[PDB]
Symmetry: D3
Subunit: 230 residues, 6 copies
């Protein structure tokens, strides 16, 4: 495939998808054994390692719907990947989402036009694979890792001068990020399993940041949920 330079059989059945290729590197190194680098095209790193005797791959996706779609389409069409777990951050848009909460997205709203192009008059609602969702949940509960399940918003512009997040928060939407709708749509289109697991990097509505130490801890919990759930 064009944006991925792996050989046949270099990419595992299960894949973690951070947005940042440097986090992909960071995860692969810290949690995986016997790591090889299978992709360097565009500096968008993909690694394959073992975690307790199972092969996992970790591939940066880039930022935004178009960018993740490319990687996901190529991981599905060219490398036959089965499970795709986005591991990422989001901006919380409601006061009741807390900085240590790991978020499991059941679904995502979006102002991306991707699905409108596909389905004209239908509001298409992307859906997580329940089996993946359930296993992530059960592994968080098993540990006492605090988890919230609900919906996110896949924004097409990071900076927004029309930003309608205020209305979305009234309807229960937990947070805003940029990839989830693409993952869930293309996964389901191809009969594959996807889930997004997200931590809070900020509170969008007040402007409040979360401290570097809090982020490090939730990032650990997130990768641990994704790995244990596999």
């Amino acid at each position: 495939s064009v944006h991925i330079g792996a050989e046949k059989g270099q990419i595992a059945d299960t894949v973690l998808l951070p947005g940042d290729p440097l986090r992909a590197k960071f995860i692969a190194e810290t949690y995986l054994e016997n790591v090889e680098c299978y992709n360097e095209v565009r500096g968008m790193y993909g690694f394959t390692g073992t975690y307790k005797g199972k092969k996992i791959s970790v591939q940066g996706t880039g930022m935004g719907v178009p960018s993740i779609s490319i990687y996901v389409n190529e991981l599905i069409q060219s490398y036959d990947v089965q499970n795709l777990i986005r591991v990422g951050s989001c901006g919380a848009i409601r006061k009741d989402v807390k900085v240590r909460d790991v978020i499991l997205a059941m679904t995502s709203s979006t102002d991306s036009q991707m699905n409108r192009v596909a389905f004209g008059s239908v509001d298409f609602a992307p859906c997580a694979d329940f089996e993946l969702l359930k296993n992530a949940y059960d592994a968080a509960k098993d540990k006492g890792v605090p988890v919230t399940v609900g919906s996110v918003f896949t924004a097409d512009q990071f900076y927004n001068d029309d930003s309608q997040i205020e209305k979305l928060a009234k309807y229960g939407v937990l947070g805003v990020e940029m990839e989830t709708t693409a993952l869930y749509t293309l996964a389901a289109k191809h009969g594959r399993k996807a889930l997004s697991i997200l931590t809070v990097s900020d509170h969008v509505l007040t402007g409040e940041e979360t401290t570097a130490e809090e982020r490090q801890t939730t990032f650990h919990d997130m990768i641990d949920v994704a790995l244990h759930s596999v």
Copy 2:
């Protein structure tokens, strides 16, 4: 309220929502003790009874997004209803959806403009309350009731001449019905808990029918799952 003839106290915090009021009569008389009919307005029957120490109301909602929105809005705003569970039928659009499986809807797609009117350029994805969904799933598993968790399509036209169902099935959508998007959207906006539990009444994309016997079996499984949920 305009369409519900109940007096203060008569309607439970928890309400089951079939489309068919005759089915509401049936549900009420079969599974609940100490039943009163609190509404006759428009023949759209609603009953309250007891089930294992808890108040339950059962309210026919009619067919289509506009009809159930009227009933849900009134139940929420005038009767401070907290938990809303739609129990009904739907058309399977995929071969691997079997006639025995009870469906729990995580989310719903729609070609209803209800949400495009409220949101503008956003594709809003309505979402189930995870807690109701998890309790319903756990109670299905407790009894070994067969369950499938995924997404549905909420149509405005039973008879859809330009039908896009062929494409929705390709995106993993399980089934078609006519109420779920409105239920989930309105519940969410008012911070209340909603879930839709559905049975297969036929296969849309082959035409074939389900026997009177499959139908009432799966209808039984569906009501027990809902009641045992709460």
Copy 3:
């Protein structure tokens, strides 16, 4: 047909369509001779009687576009019905529409998505059958029954927090109701004759109600116009 339990030849050529199955009963009883009940599916009653030697049928339709579409499609496809006259109420949105005015809808605007799904880039304008419209008019004039002819709005949500009726009233629109656009569209699609005859139940913009005695009188005039015009 699925939602209608009539036998072949139980439904007449001309049909009155109130929204409320209990009004269908009320009309059938009060104005018709030799009444039989041909439908009880969903408690959505349909009766057939004679009025001055002509067979008429009267069938509740439910509330909202999806609900009326089902009945209308089945009355047209399965029972070969020729004339369909909706008899109903609407909320007046302009001061110059008076409580005793019987309304003949020539056309209807709508925020329903039904026609947008059908016709993508066209604003489709549903149209009443002139012959029916003319005969209703002539029968009101013959009696001195006061009539106003113009357009209505077919709303998809009864309660509206985006409600754009204020702009519609500036453009001459007389009132708001929930079924007319579906009737007129499907009738015309199938080469059949439809008309909606409406009375004012309220003034939406001020909040003013109309007294029970006024409603009883206009309801009589409405059914009388529909019957005499047949």
Copy 4:
């Protein structure tokens, strides 16, 4: 006003509106006594004359929604015109529309965004003034002029390569022209009376032409109906 060179008093309360200004010259000189030309700006000719004791103006409007909107807006706002009657040609899209029948447009569909820009999520259905329509119908019947009352489609493209006319004919739409939606919308908003009277200049969906002789006959019937209307 920008596009009309008339001085106070010169333009009648009642105005006929052909698209072709040469046809406006023809109408003016043939049917009216005591004619003055009040506008030459853009060659878009407009005349005033007398007909049986009444002032009539006759104004070419050009072709398309934007052109006639300019003229209608100015006529309404600057010259306090009360009654606006478009008289023109259109393409028949249905076999049962005959070349002799004069068309009275109750309403018009459009693929013009004029109304989607003003309304948002609403499909606005422009409507004729019933009184003008009824007077025109009564004057056709008085002379036995053949008349058909229904709806038209107002196109933005005479030559429409992705044409949806095939579907519009299936919904009972009689004909295609290029001005009516704008006329009815603008009249309605300013509380003035508008009607469109059209003749068939060919059949769009067979290609065939109407003879020079049919054309001028039906053109005569059309002008007499309009003039005898007021």
Copy 5:
């Protein structure tokens, strides 16, 4: 063709398109030698003359997208025309566009629905032929005629009570007119060369007019650029 009464070989390869048939006459007379009138249908004049040994034609187009489309389609389909140069006026919407500036439109935005009908989910951007644009530019520079290159807005309603020109001016849009998007779209669709050359008739945002003497001078510069560039 229907709206044009020219004979085979009466219309030249290069055509100037003013909106006003009386300006077409004015241009033909003043700048062309050996002028003949080839079209009088609808008083929409087209003339053919010579300018320094080359045949040019000059054809009024009318006002608005639908009107220009008709002429352009017929000039392309029926008369094989190769180059089409709109010569017109526009309302400036930014302070930095000056009254003596000749405007070369590289592109145009529009609220016309024409391209949305054609291309559903694509924002289509019409484009000028660079060769024509370059030659117009070079001929203005050669003379010291002051020129600005950028984008315009093709409005569908001259008078606008929703008018969104304020936002367009923030995005660099220079002016508003009514034809350009149609020309550029149909030209390019048919493999032909189009360019619009515009002068400022007014400042829309303040209300300031430009004097009659200034307009006469810029109109000269505009025709001179169009002719020299040919």
Copy 6:
């Protein structure tokens, strides 16, 4: 700023914008003297160097409208960047687009909702700064670099299953890429200068590839044109 790790002074007023950061490294090291890397955040590399007496920065932007919008917004708002030139690849969609021609984009079509979200009912046509475009064209001509000036399509999906490219080619669109609309829109809104220069990396509508040798030749022509432009 969030995604760029530069300190005050490090980023030039003029910035080249490849999609591929490895290509940004390549461009920086090959053509510029005195290079520092000012950003490593997300591996999305950005460098500053000198070229013939002028500061140039070279910044990878990633793939897709959302990714380049983040980078352009930050460059504009935090680093007061004045001139923004995208240099990259695109897919040719027309036979007469040859693999040697460098493309200068006058404008871009899009199926991105970015602009429909900001504008509503308007089709916004993003436009290049003519001065940058003219300087780039003049520098191509100075060296005889083959150049084609026209319009591109900015897609949200590299892999577009319902693809409308067949129609866009019929309207004279040259090529497909994934960034240009965002670049031109954002530059324009902030009153800065933007241009996109593209090379052909394959023909989309035949499938065929361009040799490694054509590719690097045309890549050379593209960078010289951009650098010699400023």
